[PDB]
Design a protein around this ligand. Structure first.
Ligand SMILES: [Cl-]
Ligand SMILES: [Mg+2]
Ligand SMILES: [Mg+2]
Lengths: 195, 231, 250, 241, 243, 244, 240, 235, 111
């Protein structure tokens, strides 16, 4: 799929992901949710080759849910991100690699800190205040470099995110049909229904 | 005694007891008769039922258009061995465009049964078979024992009380061999032969099973009212 | 065919004993006496060359074996079992260490690998335990000199000095009286020869005794010159003449 | 008492199956002898053809393992041939892998290791044979190395194997006690064979015809067996002095 | 005790009782023989006629390996067939790699090693047959006999089965009275006689004679069955000698 | 065939017990006693070497106490060779976890893994079980200080104080008597040594017949330190507590 | 591989290894399951021979298989871990392939199938474990309670007990539990579960564990003090 | 000990004969074939009153035209049923048709003797396989762990089998209706059962060409039980 | 490079009547511009009143027919000499063809 954005503010992580799905020359769906809840305080968005994205995300989801039941304990966002990276680093040297890029947004309940991890299909992990995959960063990083502060509120984070989407909508040739926005904080995961 | 725990153990007199016990299962089985002339070969089998509500266990199995057998002992083992014959008959046709010789079919059964008598873990086959067929060298009748021994005969019988039918055929040898170009008379001789092994019970319509193969006759099985003619 | 013995031949009895290990230790007890003594600047290992026939050339049968340039071994018990263990011990020193780290393993880790092989023969399917106890002497840079015993169970213990086999009980008592922490290598060789004389019945000379040391580096035995850091093996087998010279001052 | 059926330890620390394999060694009732010369190694063995229907040329317990290595066996012929075929295969594989002819002592060790495995692994039985390997090695010179069912092996100045091994052993012991050397001081192999036969005659106390013996000779770069007529020539020379 | 319950177990004697019990099965079987002649070999076997219902000349016992080797055996017939099937595989792979047909001594060891292998493990049973075999190769004629232990030797004459002693005695006479040798056609006649003389040990049931031969002159070094007039001529010679 | 010689190591008795597991436990009861005591500010591991010799090199010797990683250690009771097989597996498992999640392995997860391996040998494979009982002493940021034990059955349980090996019945009674929840490491050290001194089959408890170790947060600030005691250090703590 | 047939028929038509596995269950601590009108409660015995135990970290007797299903057991503790792990893996595998969580009946059928497989597979012995599996199916308010055993048979129960002295507590449940009117509330259901264990347990201190499972993935474990209040109220009514 | 695939001196496989003893201990199952359909009935036999009897599933659907009843170690039947269902639907995939009852039974019986040292022992359960096809019509088969299967007009298996079979000997005739067969199964079940027969501890089922395989409701069976009581009291 | 496929030409034609059916095909076999045979049968009686022709690459066509004829034989063995209906034969052939989805039978089949 096309565009996935992420931003870590003071007390939460915000993920924005496009709604479009295209086969051939036709847009089959304009309300697709490119994300899976890995645990109550960990969300993963994804983008890459057709089919591989969902299969990979659901496979990761199943493994983390299995861990949660076995230990009766939620893994830290850092631990989950490391598990995901290893699976992708394992995948890249397989017969047929999984062509999937992800952002992992989580709230660490132990440290009381939001955390955003960017991982590409090769297994390249980086912790960031804000991140993106593909061409999305080419348009948005200049705005984020300018406006971003670490003490921003969730509402200020959403306003800066709106500005990023507006820039994408102006200068990108592709129509990605807007974005679904989700917030990850101490209370869990919720969706912003109006954006 | 101490040497009958498995098939891999000779007794002090050089006997294989597990094979002999497998041979015993054949004697418990229902009687079946085989005989041939120069033109045709016939199988006759006495089918057995569990009770009056039950059906009569089938005894004869077709292997190819020109070959088939009758069984006596463990029926599932006959299904395995007949399936193997079906495959071998079929391998000969598909690869060599050649109908499998009855003698070679016997050699293949012998070798398959033998492997089970020399290795640990497995067991001998618990069934005896009478194979009939018509190939390029005329009509044939074989007797298979799960020891591995296969024997070509003019006529024979296996199962419970089989000695009576075997004696009859030994007397009638010169007569029934000459029954050429007459299937009904050859079957009559087989039905009369199997009758020598009967006690108390007699041949009824759903009791008797007959099969025949010959020069211009594919292997066909007769059951039900089709054998009422011969009762 | 196929190895159909996939089950253990060594099992716990009601009393908690592992019978085959105990019986293996009994086989070690019947074996010829061998010993090891550790000095401040070296280690010595020794045993009797019990020749089966005088027509047999006892030089061809080596009871004391080089495992690495700085590690040697001797045994008590079943010779053939020892021979194959030496073959495996030599190989495992390369495959599980030298081909990875580019240097020979330290004494304690090679012992650990040998021990593992002997433990597996005590638990794996369709095999009996090894019928030997090993004494492994060696040197390495960070641990210095060391002496280890390895039993049929796979258990191993470090020793200052010890003995195994026929007259081990008497030999260990003899060593307790003579051993101290200030012994030089020559003093340890002397004590080794004294201790070993008690267990030997017949002839006692350089041709009937097998003795090796772990000591100073031997550049003369290296086989090449030009690399300063390569100074030669510390393992050296004493000659028949070298033993006899020390038997005159006995 | 299943500790006597397979190769596991008895309470005494013994392997009874190995001990019983040693007893099978003498089932043929044949005695063998091996000695070393200056340039050669000689091995002799009794030959017994009881049945007149047998082809005596095919009755043999001496084997040509490689061009340089010869092997005499003490034990039943099936196990003997089993060991012979394996030794031949191992000798050939060695030359292919390492680029030089397998030494006599190295082959002996290899076959001894294989025998050791049969004493430790339960599913494999020991071979009821004693294998005596002979050659003129390019490094060690004349060589005699002997293997048994225990997996034991060692080099020998001379050796003997069979029911009456002790009588032959002591006879050889007494000779080497006089001469005070590790070999037969003789130039030609013909005279070393004569020595071997003579000392077997003295030890066993029996006379030999040409068909009663079997002889193998190892020289530099070849091992070969003697024919009946070659042995007869040897027996004539012994009788004439 | 218990040493005879499992194959590949040495008794305190140093014996393998299971192999010795396999020999008992061989001794129980019908008589078979082999005769080495001037330029080849002759094989003959006793076939017991259990019943009149047996088709004459159909239940063939002697088997060919490759085109130049004949095999006959006494004891458990299926075990013999298994051994010949292996022999045919061994002969095929030899010819495949080396081009030339397998020499008889080479072939003899292939069977020997295979039979011996079935005395090494308790997971297999020893062979219940003694096999007499041989033929003609580049070095001439060869006759062999192979026992359940894997033991085999070369022979001038060979015999096994229930009437082996009677046969052996007759074979020993031929060796003594013919040091210069015996012809192929003579060996066929003598083979018939010996089987008839050996039939006194199985005298209850009547029997059928079966003979085969390989000869450099008479069969071009190929294995063939003795048929028709030559077979009847041998039967007549045999019947004349017993009377 | 081979069936004749199979002991059948993985079967139930008529009473529903596993023969080999029970006999393995009988073996372990003759092994040197090992004790573990958990306190609020650390864990103590104490263990008795079996009838030693004067010629045994003690300072380089290790038969009882092993290090699995920086946070977790174990005390052994039973066959040392069997224990080393399992220890090396546990060391690998801890490193696999660290490589995967980039965090030190939680104590229980490591314990469960080893106990599952032991369980397998009682249910399948036809092999004898490991004649070993472990005391696991460890720390992680979820449950803090933890003591566990596992035995040849593959069953594991958590403890405040526990003993394995010889005289566990007597040793557990003494621990149950003097142990309290608000106890500290220095007190637990004293309890461990006093318990061994009374339960020991030897005439007197000395430094050369002991292995000792502590896991303390007594490290500079929020972190954990493992201390495997040296022979001279065991001699000093024996004098301090007033045993020698 | 080790292929030995350990579970086999005897002349009288019994598989002794499976029957001896039931004896291991008889030795295990008592477990009880009671389903009310809108809930299920799982009670478990803890033998008080083991004191100085760390109850924080000691493996709990009741295990969550998924967010809506739980599993308790009686018998060999080590054996139970293998069934629980397999069950947990299958639960996630079902969600991944069918996009619905397992039903309680399905999960039970899987666990029972594993137990059965170990009664006619070579080289393995049966599980010395019987299980009680309880929960609520997705989008369903009808309580579910099943039992399994080493042989591999399973069935549904209004109330059931397994383990040592289970004969006694089953006797209690058979006369006290009414099908026409089951425990209407959570209190009544827990009270009946505690009462049943008090017939066998000994002391009502730390020896009783209770786990309440309600619809829509609502699972909680009661504490010592909460259970102790039930123990107090029961005996005070009994003194009359 | 001894081999799993060992023959006795009488020529029987020990393990197969011992599995038959386990089947004799099982709960009673009865089948009756008529020209209007085949009826299958079973004894549930709950071990306790707290056990919810409706969860006892001893009658099972294999296909729309084939049903199955079991007796013995019922846990062993699950893999046999799974194989039967797979075989039935797989044949429908390959040949676009219903599978013959005999062919289905043969496929199940092929598993029977696949044991040795494959599974470690024979199955400890017998099956009554009832169904209908166009070629041979309404059929009832009895599948044993020996690998043998007999066709039956009527058959009983389980603990009260020989007593029930003797009763089926007298009662069965070729002109039986479906209703008559239903009452006849209930009659014989009531005779051999320990506890008193009712709709909760006994279950009925049938297979007809029109409606296919159907398990009867407890309300429907209850009426047939009441109809039975009245007709027995009628004379 | 080795090309495992070929083209043997030919043409076939099937027409269904009310109570009958025909299956026709020419008898010419060819490679490129050469004639192999002027009479090489292409339409076969496969048993059970079914006729079949696999047109395209003769080697694959002969193998398919040979396999189906075999399938008919085993259908009789396994299902009590039951007649194989035309619809059941069609479905069976679908599975024979798809067994080589990744190395196809290069034929256009008609029954
Ligand atoms: Cl080697
Ligand atoms: Mg990246
Ligand atoms: Mg062995």
């Amino acid at each position: 799929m096309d565009i996935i954005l992420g931003i870590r503010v003071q007390d939460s992580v915000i993920l924005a992901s496009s709604k479009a799905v295209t086969r051939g020359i036709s847009v089959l769906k304009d309300s697709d949710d490119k994300t899976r809840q890995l645990s109550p305080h960990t969300l993963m968005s994804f983008a890459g080759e057709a089919g591989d994205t969902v299969q990979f995300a659901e496979y990761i989801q199943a493994n983390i849910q299995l861990y949660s039941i076995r230990e009766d304990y939620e893994l830290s966002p850092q631990a989950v991100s490391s598990f995901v990276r290893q699976e992708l680093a394992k995948s890249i040297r397989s017969r047929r690699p999984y062509q999937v890029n992800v952002l992992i947004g989580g709230y660490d309940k132990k440290k009381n800190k939001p955390e955003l991890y960017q991982i590409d299909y090769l297994g390249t992990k980086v912790e960031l205040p804000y991140g993106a995959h593909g061409y999305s960063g080419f348009y948005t990083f200049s705005l984020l470099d300018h406006h971003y502060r670490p003490d921003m509120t969730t509402e200020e984070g959403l306003d800066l995110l709106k500005l990023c989407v507006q820039e994408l909508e102006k200068r990108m040739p592709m129509d990605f049909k807007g974005v679904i926005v989700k917030i990850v904080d101490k209370d869990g995961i919720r969706q912003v229904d109006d954006f | 005694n101490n040497y009958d725990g498995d098939t891999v153990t000779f007794s002090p007199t050089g006997r294989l007891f597990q094979v002999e016990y497998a041979l015993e299962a054949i004697k418990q089985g229902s009687v079946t008769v085989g005989l041939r002339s120069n033109t045709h070969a016939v199988l006759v089998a006495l089918k057995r039922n569990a009770d009056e509500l039950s059906s009569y266990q089938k005894k004869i199995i077709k292997c190819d258009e020109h070959m088939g057998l009758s069984l006596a002992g463990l029926a599932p083992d006959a299904r395995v061995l007949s399936n193997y014959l079906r495959q071998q008959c079929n391998y000969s046709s598909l690869v060599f465009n050649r109908k499998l010789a009855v003698e070679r079919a016997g050699h293949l059964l012998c070798d398959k049964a033998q492997k089970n008598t020399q290795s640990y873990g497995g067991r001998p086959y618990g069934v005896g078979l009478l194979i009939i067929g018509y190939d390029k060298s005329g009509a044939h009748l074989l007797e298979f024992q799960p020891s591995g021994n296969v024997t070509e005969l003019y006529g024979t019988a296996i199962g419970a009380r089989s000695q009576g039918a075997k004696t009859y055929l030994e007397r009638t040898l010169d007569t029934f061999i000459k029954i050429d170009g007459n299937p009904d008379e050859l079957i009559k001789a087989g039905v009369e032969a199997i009758s020598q092994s009967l006690r108390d019970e007699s041949l009824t319509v759903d009791n008797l099973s007959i099969a025949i193969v010959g020069k211009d006759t594919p292997f066909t099985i007769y059951d039900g009212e089709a054998v009422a003619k011969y009762i | 065919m196929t190895d159909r013995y996939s089950f253990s031949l060594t099992t716990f009895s009601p009393s908690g004993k592992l019978g085959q290990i105990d019986y293996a230790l009994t086989a070690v007890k019947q074996g010829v006496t061998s010993l090891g003594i550790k000095a401040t600047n070296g280690v010595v290992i020794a045993t009797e060359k019990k020749s089966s026939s005088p027509l047999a050339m006892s030089e061809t049968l080596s009871k004391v074996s080089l495992l690495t340039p700085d590690i040697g071994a001797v045994y008590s018990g079943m010779g053939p079992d020892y021979r194959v263990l030496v073959d495996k011990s030599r190989k495992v020193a390369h495959t599980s260490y030298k081909r990875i780290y580019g240097e020979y393993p330290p004494t304690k880790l090679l012992v650990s690998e040998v021990a593992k092989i002997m433990q597996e023969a005590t638990q794996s399917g369709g095999v009996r335990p090894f019928g030997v106890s090993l004494l492994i002497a060696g040197h390495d840079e960070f641990n210095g000199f060391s002496l280890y015993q390895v039993d049929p169970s796979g258990s191993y213990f470090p020793w200052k000095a010890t003995a195994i086999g026929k007259g081990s009980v008497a030999a260990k008592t003899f060593l307790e009286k003579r051993w101290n922490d200030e012994l030089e290598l020559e003093d340890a060789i002397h004590i080794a020869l004294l201790t070993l004389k008690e267990s030997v019945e017949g002839e006692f000379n350089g041709d009937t005794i097998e003795l090796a040391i772990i000591g100073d580096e031997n550049p003369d035995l290296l086989g090449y010159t030009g690399i300063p850091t390569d100074k030669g093996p510390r393992f050296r087998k004493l000659t028949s003449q070298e033993i006899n010279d020390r038997l005159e001052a006995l | 008492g299943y500790d006597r059926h397979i190769t596991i330890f008895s309470p005494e620390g013994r392997l009874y199956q190995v001990e019983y394999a040693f007893k099978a060694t003498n089932q043929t009732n044949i005695n063998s002898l091996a000695v070393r010369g200056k340039d050669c190694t000689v091995v002799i063995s009794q030959k017994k053809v009881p049945d007149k229907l047998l082809d005596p040329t095919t009755v043999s317990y001496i084997f040509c393992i490689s061009r340089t290595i010869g092997m005499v066996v003490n034990g039943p012929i099936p196990d003997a041939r089993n060991a012979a075929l394996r030794a031949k295969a191992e000798a050939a594989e060695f030359r292919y892998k390492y680029g030089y002819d397998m030494p006599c002592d190295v082959l002996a060790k290899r076959m001894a290791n294989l025998s050791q495995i049969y004493t430790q692994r339960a599913y494999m039985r020991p071979l009821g044979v004693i294998l005596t390997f002979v050659s003129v090695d390019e490094e060690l010179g004349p060589s005699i190395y002997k293997t048994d069912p225990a997996g034991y092996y060692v080099g020998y100045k001379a050796t003997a194997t069979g029911p009456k091994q002790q009588e032959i052993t002591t006879n050889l012991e007494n000779h080497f006690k006089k001469s005070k050397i590790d070999h037969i001081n003789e130039e030609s192999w013909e005279k070393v064979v004569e020595f071997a036969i003579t000392h077997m005659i003295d030890a066993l106390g029996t006379e030999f015809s040409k068909n009663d013996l079997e002889v193998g000779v190892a020289t530099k770069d070849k091992f070969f067996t003697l024919s009946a007529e070659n042995i007869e020539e040897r027996l004539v020379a012994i009788a004439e002095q | 005790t218990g040493y005879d319950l499992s194959n590949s177990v040495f008794s305190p004697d140093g014996r393998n009782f299971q192999v010795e019990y396999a020999v008992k099965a061989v001794e129980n079987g019908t008589t078979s023989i082999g005769i080495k002649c001037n330029d080849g070999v002759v094989f003959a076997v006793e076939k017991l006629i259990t019943s009149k219902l047996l088709v004459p000349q159909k239940n063939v016992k002697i088997q060919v390996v490759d085109r130049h080797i004949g095999c006959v055996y006494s004891g458990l017939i299926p075990d013999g067939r298994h051994l010949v099937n292996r022999g045919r595989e061994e002969a095929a792979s030899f010819k495949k790699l080396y081009k030339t047909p397998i020499p008889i001594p080479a072939f003899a060891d292939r069977l020997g090693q295979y039979v011996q292998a079935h005395t090494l493990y308790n997971s297999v049973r020893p062979f219940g047959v003694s096999t007499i075999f041989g033929g003609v190769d580049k070095n001439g004629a060869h006759l062999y006999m192979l026992e359940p232990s894997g033991s085999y030797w070369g022979y001038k004459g060979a015999a096994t089965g229930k009437g082996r002693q009677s046969a052996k005695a007759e074979l020993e006479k031929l060796v003594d009275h013919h040091p210069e040798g015996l012809s192929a056609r003579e060996a066929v006649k003598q083979a018939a006689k010996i089987i008839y003389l050996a039939h006194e040990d199985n005298k209850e049931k009547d029997f059928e004679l079966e003979i085969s031969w390989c000869s450099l002159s008479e069969t071009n070094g190929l294995h063939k069955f003795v048929k028709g007039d030559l077979l009847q001529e041998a039967i007549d010679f045999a019947q004349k000698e017993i009377n | 065939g081979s069936r004749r010689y199979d002991s059948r190591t993985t079967i139930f008795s008529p009473e529903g017990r596993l023969y080999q597991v029970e006999y393995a436990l009988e073996s372990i009861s003759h092994a040197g006693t090992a004790i573990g005591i958990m306190a609020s500010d650390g864990i103590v591991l104490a263990a008795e070497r079996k009838v030693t010799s004067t010629l045994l090199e003690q300072d380089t010797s290790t038969e009882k106490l092993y290090k699995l990683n920086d946070k977790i250690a174990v005390a052994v009771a039973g066959l040392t060779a069997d224990a080393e097989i399992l220890i090396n597996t546990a060391r690998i498992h801890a490193q696999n976890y660290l490589k995967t999640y980039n965090e030190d392995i939680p104590v229980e997860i490591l314990v469960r893994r080893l106990s599952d391996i032991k369980q397998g040998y009682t249910q399948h494979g036809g092999l004898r079980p490991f004649g070993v009982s472990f005391i696991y002493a460890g720390y992680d940021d979820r449950y803090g200080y933890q003591l566990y034990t596992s035995n040849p059955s593959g069953n594991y349980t958590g403890w405040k104080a526990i003993s394995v090996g010889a005289n566990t019945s007597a040793a557990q009674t003494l621990l149950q008597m003097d142990y309290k929840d608000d106890m500290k490491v220095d007190d637990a050290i004293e309890l461990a040594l006093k318990t061994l001194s009374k339960t020991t089959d030897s005439s007197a408890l000395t430094y050369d017949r002991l292995e000792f170790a502590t896991i303390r947060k007594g490290a500079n600030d929020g972190e954990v330190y493992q201390k495997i005691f040296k022979p001279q250090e065991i001699k000093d703590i024996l004098v301090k507590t007033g045993i020698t | 591989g080790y292929d030995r047939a350990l579970s086999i028929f005897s002349p009288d038509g019994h598989i002794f290894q499976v029957e001896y596995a039931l004896e291991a269950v008889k030795r295990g601590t008592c477990a009880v399951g009671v389903k009310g009108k809108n809930c299920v409660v799982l009670g478990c015995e803890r033998r008080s021979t083991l004191k100085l135990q760390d109850t924080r970290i000691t493996p709990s007797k009741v295990s969550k298989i998924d967010s809506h299903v739980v599993l308790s057991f009686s018998g060999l503790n080590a054996d139970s871990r293998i069934l629980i792990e397999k069950a947990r893996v299958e639960a996630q595998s079902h969600r991944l392939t069918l996009e619905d969580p397992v039903t309680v009946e399905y999960l039970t059928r899987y666990v029972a199938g594993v137990q059965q497989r170990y009664t006619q597979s070579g080289g393995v012995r049966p599980f010395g474990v019987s299980t009680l599996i309880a929960g609520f199916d997705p989008r369903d308010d009808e309580p579910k309670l099943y039992q399994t055993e080493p042989s591999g048979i399973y069935s549904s129960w209004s109330a059931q007990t397994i383990g040592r002295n289970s004969k006694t507590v089953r006797e209690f449940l058979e006369k006290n539990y009414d099908r026409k009117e089951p425990p209407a509330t959570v209190e009544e259901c827990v009270k009946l579960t505690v009462r049943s264990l008090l017939e066998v347990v000994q002391t009502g201190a730390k020896n009783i564990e209770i786990t309440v499972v309600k619809p829509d993935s609502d699972i909680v474990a009661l504490s010592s003090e909460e259970i102790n209040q039930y123990v107090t109220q029961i005996e005070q009514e009994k003194q009359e | 000990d001894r081999g799993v695939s060992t023959f006795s001196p009488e020529g029987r496989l020990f393990q197969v004969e011992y599995s038959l003893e386990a089947i004799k201990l099982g709960s009673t199952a009865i089948g009756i074939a008529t020209k209007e359909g085949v009826v299958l009935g079973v004894e549930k036999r709950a071990t306790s009153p707290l056990l919810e009897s409706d969860s006892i599933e001893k009658i099972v659907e294999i296909d729309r035209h084939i049903g199955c009843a079991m007796s013995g170690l019922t846990a062993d039947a699950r893999s046999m049923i799974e194989h039967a269902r797979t075989a039935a639907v797989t044949h429908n995939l390959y040949y676009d048709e219903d599978i013959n009852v005999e062919s289905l039974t043969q496929s199940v019986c092929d598993l029977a003797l696949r044991f040795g040292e494959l599974m470690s022992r024979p199955f400890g359960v017998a099956l009554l396989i009832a169904g209908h096809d166009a070629d041979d019509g309404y059929q009832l088969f009895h599948a044993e762990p020996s690998g043998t299967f007999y066709r039956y007009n009527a058959k009983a298996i389980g603990s009260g089998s020989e007593g029930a079979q003797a009763e089926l000997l007298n009662e069965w005739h070729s002109s039986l209706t479906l209703k008559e067969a239903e009452l006849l199964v209930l009659k014989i079940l009531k005779q051999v059962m320990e506890e008193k027969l009712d709709e909760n501890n006994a279950q009925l089922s049938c297979i007809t060409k029109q409606d296919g395989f159907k398990i009867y409701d407890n309300e429907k069976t209850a009426e047939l039980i009441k109809e039975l009581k009245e007709k027995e009291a009628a004379e | 490079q080795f090309n495992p496929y070929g083209d043997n030409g030919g043409t076939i034609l099937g027409i269904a009547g009310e109570d009958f059916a025909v299956l026709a095909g020419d008898t010419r076999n060819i490679t490129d511009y050469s004639i192999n045979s002027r009479y090489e049968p292409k339409v076969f009686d496969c048993g059970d009143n079914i006729v079949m022709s696999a047109n395209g690459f003769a080697a694959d066509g002969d193998a398919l027919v040979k396999r189906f004829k075999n399938s008919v034989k085993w259908y009789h063995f396994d299902h009590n000499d039951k007649k194989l209906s035309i619809n059941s034969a069609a479905r069976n052939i679908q599975h024979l063809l798809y067994s080589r989805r990744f190395f196809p039978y290069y034929v256009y089949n008609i029954i």
